[PDB]
Design an enzyme around this catalytic site. Structure first.
Site, PDB file in Angstrom:
ATOM      1  N   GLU A 158      37.781  47.114  47.602  1.00 58.40           N
ATOM      2  CA  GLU A 158      38.414  47.932  46.586  1.00 58.40           C
ATOM      3  C   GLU A 158      38.122  49.433  46.740  1.00 58.40           C
ATOM      4  O   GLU A 158      38.919  50.226  46.284  1.00 58.40           O
ATOM      5  CB  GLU A 158      38.033  47.447  45.187  1.00 58.40           C
ATOM      6  CG  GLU A 158      38.431  46.009  44.904  1.00 58.40           C
ATOM      7  CD  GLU A 158      37.863  45.548  43.597  1.00 58.40           C
ATOM      8  OE1 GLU A 158      36.713  45.974  43.290  1.00 58.40           O
ATOM      9  OE2 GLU A 158      38.540  44.781  42.885  1.00 58.40           O
ATOM     10  N   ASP A 175      46.090  38.011  41.644  1.00 61.86           N
ATOM     11  CA  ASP A 175      46.243  36.600  41.297  1.00 61.86           C
ATOM     12  C   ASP A 175      46.637  36.562  39.838  1.00 61.86           C
ATOM     13  O   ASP A 175      46.635  37.592  39.144  1.00 61.86           O
ATOM     14  CB  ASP A 175      44.931  35.831  41.461  1.00 61.86           C
ATOM     15  CG  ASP A 175      43.801  36.404  40.596  1.00 61.86           C
ATOM     16  OD1 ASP A 175      43.166  37.398  41.010  1.00 61.86           O
ATOM     17  OD2 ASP A 175      43.555  35.902  39.484  1.00 61.86           O
TER      18      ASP A 175
HETATM   19  N1  LIG Z   1      41.243  35.687  38.083  1.00 59.22           N
HETATM   20  C1  LIG Z   1      40.374  36.697  37.948  1.00 59.22           C
HETATM   21  N2  LIG Z   1      39.390  36.581  37.027  1.00 59.22           N
HETATM   22  C2  LIG Z   1      38.522  37.591  36.883  1.00 59.22           C
HETATM   23  N3  LIG Z   1      38.450  38.740  37.546  1.00 59.22           N
HETATM   24  C3  LIG Z   1      39.440  38.831  38.451  1.00 59.22           C
HETATM   25  N4  LIG Z   1      39.708  39.887  39.292  1.00 59.22           N
HETATM   26  C4  LIG Z   1      40.798  39.508  40.032  1.00 59.22           C
HETATM   27  N5  LIG Z   1      41.261  38.320  39.725  1.00 59.22           N
HETATM   28  C5  LIG Z   1      40.414  37.883  38.714  1.00 59.22           C
END
Ligand SMILES: Nc1ncnc2[nH]cnc12
Ligand SMILES: Nc1ncnc2c1ncn2[C@@H]1O[C@H](CSCC[C@H](N)C(=O)O)[C@@H](O)[C@H]1O
EC number: 3.2.2.9
Lengths: 233, 233
Positions: free
Chosen positions: A13, A198
């Site tokens: 990141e 996601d």
């Molecule tokens: N599903 C997720 N839960 C928590 N932090 C995240 N950062 C990126 N995806 C995430």
């Protein structure tokens, strides 16, 4: 001159932003790393925090304390909860709440902790500047409540619980509300500008692996333009 | 040659201890007050911790970063998980873990956060020191695992979870692990000590306000003896 502090959790990141820093210098304080220099002529201090609330808290604290930036941007990836959202899309905090704090027995709102507001408010001018950058850059974005916790959400009961308790939450992650809490205490304006990796279902770990580099690139584009926009016009 | 950092949850303890510091100087950073001076000839730094992991991390970080103590002594009160404990026992952590951290999607152990140990180990000589000190006060020292998290767990519907996920855990509260984490990050030996205010349904004799009156006195003396015995050598 404005100094802008930037916080991201993970090497992936932070790595593109760090490569763009000129005159770049590295400070380790145990053992988080802060990179100082100029990004497109603007004084920046970039922290790599590590993962989760206390990592974020300790780094934000060391950043404010040592470098005294005027403003804080938190960048990186996040799990989309808003229906529109697709991988790579931007989320901007209008606020930040913990999804896993509960002292409701003593009268607080769910997610609120003592001496804090129930939600931490992102600074209005920083939000408006981020929205200016979204439109200039022709990105898909959603502005809204980001929720944080020490949990990588992966479907099932974990996710359901966050949608029940925070039906307006647009994205979930592990540092932003900790950063917002530190900045409340130091009286420093914050915004989170993150990208979706996601959608926090029971594939999220696979999606995150697949799409973290896209989330990082998209949030890096926003941030590097946002520091210009904030520090000048 | 030593400087000793003291972080206390119980306000009355921090008060009594402050009033004992010679050549006291006070600092405010980020809404935390840190007192520095000599307690019984030993250089100390003193701070009351806030509520939850972020607030505690913040406080800890600013103490460790500004005052550079050689060691952390971290005091307060906790709930008892082991049915074998008595209200008034003093738990000395051998280890701290998060009960509300879940990155198990990527295979980490429950309660473990990326880049960290699955538990943060208390320093063995400070554990031993804290123990002697407790027993010399005519108090019952019980060593073991403390878990913490940003949900208040008294009852619930909840508390398993805690015993299910952490058999071995004997105490729960809201800051210990967060302080343990920060100390681990700065490589500063710590010990976490906790007066037991109630045990899981061995429902209960004295109100919390009354427990705290006694606990904060016993803990104050404990801390001033521990500081001396650590200085002495
Ligand atoms: N599903 C997720 N839960 C928590 N932090 C995240 N950062 C990126 N995806 C995430
Ligand atoms: C975003 O995305 C990150 C999740 S990373 C959690 C997975 C972690 N990198 C690992 O060891 O697998 C957090 O920093 C969150 O805030």
């Amino acid at each position: 001159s404005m100094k802008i502090g930037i916080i991201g959790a993970m090497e992936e990141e932070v790595t593109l932003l760090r490569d763009k820093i000129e005159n770049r210098q590295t400070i380790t304080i145990g053992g988080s790393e802060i990179y100082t220099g100029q990004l497109h002529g603007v004084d920046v201090a970039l922290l790599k925090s590590g993962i989760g609330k206390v990592a974020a808290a300790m780094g934000a604290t060391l950043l404010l304390e040592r470098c005294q930036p005027d403003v804080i941007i938190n960048t990186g990836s996040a799990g989309g909860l808003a229906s529109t959202l697709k991988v790579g899309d931007i989320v901007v905090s209008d606020e930040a709440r913990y999804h896993d704090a509960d002292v409701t027995a003593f009268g607080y709102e769910y997610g609120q902790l003592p001496g804090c507001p129930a939600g931490f408010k992102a600074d209005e001018k920083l939000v408006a500047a981020a929205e200016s950058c979204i439109k200039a850059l022709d990105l898909n974005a959603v502005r809204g409540l980001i929720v944080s916790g020490d949990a990588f959400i992966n479907g099932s009961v974990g996710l359901a619980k966050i949608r029940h308790n925070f039906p307006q939450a647009i994205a979930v992650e592990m540092e932003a509300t900790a950063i917002a809490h530190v900045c409340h205490n130091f009286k420093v304006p914050f915004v989170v500008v993150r990208a979706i990796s996601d959608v926090a279902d029971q594939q999220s770990h696979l999606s995150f692996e697949e799409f973290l580099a896209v989330a990082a690139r998209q949030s890096t584009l926003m941030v590097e333009n946002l520091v210009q926009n904030l520090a000048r016009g």
